[PDB]
């Protein structure tokens, strides 16, 4: 899972997106973060799989 600071940024940009004020630079930033989030998630799922 990615840093707490980055989760906070994802939430901030998600809010801008819903409000329709997000810029193109922020959209690109959000995409990069969403990829970093999914990567940290797949990694975490690797050790969550090891359970009954």
Curated annotation (Swiss-Prot):
Domain of life: Bacteria
Cellular localisation: Cytoplasm
Keywords attached to this entry: Cytoplasm
A GO cellular component entry from the record: cytoplasm
The keyword Cytoplasm is assigned to this record: yes
Induction or repression: Repressed by LexA.
Family: Belongs to the UPF0291 family.
Name of the molecule in the record: UPF0291 protein YnzC
Source organism of this protein record: Bacillus subtilis (strain 168)
Organism lineage string: Bacteria, Bacillati, Bacillota, Bacilli, Bacillales
